[PDB]
Design a protein around this ligand. Structure first.
Ligand SMILES: O=C(O)[C@H]1NC(=O)[C@H](O)[C@@H](O)[C@@H]1O
Ligand SMILES: O=C(O)[C@H]1NC(=O)[C@H](O)[C@@H](O)[C@@H]1O
Lengths: 596, 596
């Protein structure tokens, strides 16, 4: 469908992101048979929402649970809600959610990281209390996005195995809410912003107003109307603009009005006037070459598996700001929209990424990745859908300068191309206004990768000197430089190293500057930087990883992934100061001149 | 060469192990060419001996060095040693040494864990200073024990590669001593103990008098002669037994007197009256069921690498005693003989092991492990040769109950059985008195493993739950039991678990009791224990490792190896208390009731 972001004015929100909900596991999978949504959840403990369910109770068995869990909550419809359009929305429900308003199934969703909502007007009475039961599923398979394989052992007990390097946290990770609109309501806006050598431009609009004529006005930061439009559908605005720019992100405001004969609806959409374009080996923003700095991030913290939190967001952005990061990539799933609102407001450049990681069977059972058994026509449709829902969500955020379709598919087999070519094309139809990318795994190098020509920007995840040439900066450096030059000459695209990093145990110090030591982390990033500055095609550097985060258990992960610049409690490792010096020492948004 | 532990009676030694020798790297491999041994090493620096050269200087470039290093030292010969036999002895020089005394090449050795000695009387003048120069080589190859491959880079320098987990520390690891003897002397002995039902029984001497007759009296701990023979070549002695027992380890003393016309050489040996053999599923200590507790250990410590150190030895034994260890294995190389005197004297049980580890290519470039390319006849000789020298050294140490011919060879390839059958043969003949073993890796399991039948005791290194069934105690327990039971069937041989362990970060704590957490170590060690007990065949437990220790760099090793019950600075992890409680809550040398 269509997704607008709930704002208040004529339209109003009840939070119900009030956190305390009833919660129980459904170990027997009785829940649907017995219609638990029909009465109060039995044997139910208190849980916080928004939040992962896994870590809230410090219990291994709830953490490692695979299958169905139930959230239940009673809530009060505002009396004043009367005959307005009432909508129940979930910003996210991890992997799968099915929702009941009082023994009435109102919605269903597969996707752990984007919103789903249903008009509930007919199913609720204003001034009365309703029971809300969500059945949440955390299972992955070959058609889920990201993919996985549940293994049931001989006892019929499920266990989730998956192919990506973060932990499969689940639950209601983001805001759930009740919200209002008039029976005439704006429900889709699409803004495209053009700029022409930065003295003037046009901002096209496209508007869907469920039964309403629309009018448009564009306002300053200091709230004065600078352009108007009728053409309630397709209306183009000309301006002497304050451009939304990486440093500051100046935001205009577009007010969308849906008028019925008796009814009004008012939707304000923040707009940054900026162009994004690749020209040759450059990534241009408002027609200037940009240089990315900053991180691949995760949504991860102690006690919240991936649950959204405002303090964590305020804090992490103070860190990213302090360190001189100008960008990030929503590694491995769409992030909370609050994050993109922040980025828009603060002029943070973002690479927006679907949840399509784990397409790889060689990261470290089926023998063909592209297979009817394993990655197939159904998967591709699920993949396209994931792309659709992400673009439908994030299309108007000026902070998003690029779409990332997938992280680290195995592109060696013939068929990778078969599978990805249509997604690349589809994606571009969905959004013509942004470069497109597919993040690239180390072993699909310049000579073996089959897919990268189909996208606009080259985003490489590189670990030379870590997973390969381990401990050896000297030969690490040679392989890295040779690889990046090969890519440059092969594709003549802008290259962003979207991942480079080494596990570092905070407090592990070594005179020998060897693996897993603060000093090795320092020397290794430093060597990588030396190379980047020698390669003109390199247009960006995003360190892996903002902070330590949880993964599945194994021999390769010491209590988790330790490639953070900060620890999970947001303590700086000495590499944090190193990056601070490089990033705050550069000219903003500008690439070093390959010397101090 | 004939091998006797120098001791002080009518015989004298001056340790040159007084530590400060002059040291140099020969990066240019000029050393031999220019007879560096003829003049003071230039570009020299002070180094301590006994100790690894690698970590003494906090320099990576020295730590990772492969090739020849030069040790030089001047020493005033004592005036009272003038027409006496003078012997220069190195208890160990890691990998290879070439020794000169003032431009006089005196000795050469391959094998980093056993002594080598030569008479220097002709090349040295008593009351004068002579210059000692040593060429130490750390390079390993296929002919070497343990094996390795050395690669010369595209730039021209050497880098070592090897297949055993611990770090390749090299240098002069054990003491060097000048050594005195009469012109007629003892250079060999051998003793055997027979004890039938702990009634009085006999000790057969066999000796080598280098031109003398011997009187050979046995003394009690009170120097009270309780038996005598004059047959300097073969005897027997019989009295009410007084057993060398694992509890306290009582010893007798055998004066070996060797007579010439002008000179008498009294050599003293220590003797522990005890019996070791297998009956079916049981390892019997003096005809009585023993159950092993204690560790796989290494020679590794903070700044000395594998260099011997008395304080470290005193301290480690305090800890093993405290924790209830009765046994350990000289992991993957033979230890400093001081360790074996301690075990003899305190009655500790020792599974003695050669340096033959890393025969395997699957632990984590040649096609066939046993082949001209990889392991060949030549390699089988050195293996033999290494086994010769060990038994030559430790044959008389009562604490040694059993030989471990090697650690973790891959027996799946073709020829594995052909390789080990003859070496098994040669060893049984070399010491008929002690049982013999080969320590077995996880992936050569009961059904897959060849070559388990040629050995008397089954020594298993098992990791279920940690490398496989990663983090899963429940399945790991079943696999382990079925595995161990499957082992009682194929053979009804005594089973000792020589390694069972999990990497654990001191200070990593988890409510989820997951991998690399102090808790997990406890839970996992606990789990092996419940299984261990149920198997009648299980004669012992030896935890991997005693303490954290260095390894070559890689993504699987964080500090180095972290499976230590103690950290490298000897601080206990919570699992030290788990073991303490079991190993002292037992009856000594006995098995638990397969229940409390
Ligand atoms: O293994 C890593 O450290 C990271 N490398 C990658 O290439 C992946 O894109 C990341 O998910 C992963 O966390
Ligand atoms: O990897 C380990 O935890 C240990 N397991 C083994 O089987 C080896 O005998 C040891 O060297 C090694 O350190």
């Amino acid at each position: 469908s269509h997704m607008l972001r709930p704002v208040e004015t004529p339209t109003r929100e009840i939070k119900k992101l009030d956190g305390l909900w009833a919660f129980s596991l459904d170990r027997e999978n009785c829940g649907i048979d017995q219609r638990w949504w029909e009465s109060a959840l039995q044997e139910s403990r208190a849980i916080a929402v928004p939040g992962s369910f896994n870590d809230q109770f410090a219990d291994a068995d709830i953490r490692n649970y695979a299958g169905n869990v139930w959230y239940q909550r009673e809530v009060f419809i505002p009396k004043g809600w009367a005959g307005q359009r009432i909508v129940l929305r979930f910003d996210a429900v991890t992997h799968y959610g099915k929702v009941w308003v009082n023994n009435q199934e109102v919605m269903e969703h597969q996707g752990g990281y984007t919103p789903f909502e249903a008009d509930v007007t007919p199913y609720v009475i204003a001034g009365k209390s309703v029971r809300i039961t969500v059945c949440v599923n955390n299972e992955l398979n070959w058609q889920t996005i990201p993919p996985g394989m549940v293994i049931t052992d001989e006892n019929g007990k499920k266990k989730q195995s998956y192919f990506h390097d973060f932990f499969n946290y689940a639950g209601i990770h983001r805001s759930v809410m009740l919200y209002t609109t008039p029976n005439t309501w704006v429900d889709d806006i699409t803004v495209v912003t053009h700029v022409a050598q930065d003295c003037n431009h046009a901002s096209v609009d496209w508007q869907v107003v469920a039964n309403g004529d629309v009018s448009v006005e564009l306002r300053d930061a200091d709230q004065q109307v600078v352009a108007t439009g009728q053409g309630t559908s397709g209306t183009l605005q000309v301006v002497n603009p304050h451009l939304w720019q990486p440093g500051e992100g100046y935001l205009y405001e577009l007010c969308v009005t849906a008028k019925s004969q008796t009814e009004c609806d008012i939707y304000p959409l923040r707009v940054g006037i900026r162009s994004v374009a690749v020209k040759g080996e450059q990534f241009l923003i408002n027609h200037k070459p940009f240089y990315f700095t900053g991180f691949g991030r995760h949504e991860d913290a102690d006690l919240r598996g991936k649950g959204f939190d405002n303090v964590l967001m305020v804090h992490d952005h103070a860190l990213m700001d302090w360190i001189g990061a100008n960008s990030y990539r929503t590694s491995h799933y769409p992030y909370a929209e609050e994050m993109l609102d922040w980025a828009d407001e603060h002029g943070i450049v973002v690479i927006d990424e679907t949840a399509a990681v784990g397409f790889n069977l060689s990261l470290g059972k089926p023998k063909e990745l592209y297979s009817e058994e394993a990655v197939n026509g159904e998967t591709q449709q699920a993949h396209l859908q994931a792309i659709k829902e992400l673009i439908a969500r994030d299309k108007n955020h000026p902070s998003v300068v690029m779409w990332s379709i997938a992280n680290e598919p195995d592109t060696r087999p013939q068929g990778a191309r078969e599978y990805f070519a249509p997604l690349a094309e589809a994606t571009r139809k969905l959004d013509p206004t942004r470069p497109i990318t597919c993040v690239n795994v180390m072993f699909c190098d310049a000579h073996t990768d089959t897919i990268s020509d189909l996208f606009d920007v080259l985003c490489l995840n590189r670990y030379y000197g870590w997973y390969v040439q381990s401990g050896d900066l000297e030969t690490a450096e040679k392989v890295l430089e040779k690889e990046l030059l090969a890519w440059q000459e092969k594709l003549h695209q802008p290259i962003i190293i979207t991942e480079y990093g080494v596990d570092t145990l905070a407090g592990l110090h070594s005179m020998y500057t060897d693996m897993w030591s603060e000093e090795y982390q320092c020397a290794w990033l430093d060597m990588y930087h030396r190379v980047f500055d020698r390669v003109s095609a390199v247009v960006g550097e995003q360190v892996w990883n903002f902070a330590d985060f949880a993964t599945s258990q194994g021999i390769l992960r010491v209590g988790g992934n330790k490639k953070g610049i900060f620890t999970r409690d947001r303590k700086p490792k000495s590499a944090a100061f190193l990056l601070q010096k490089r990033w705050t020492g550069m000219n903003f948004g500008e690439k070093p001149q390959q010397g101090g």
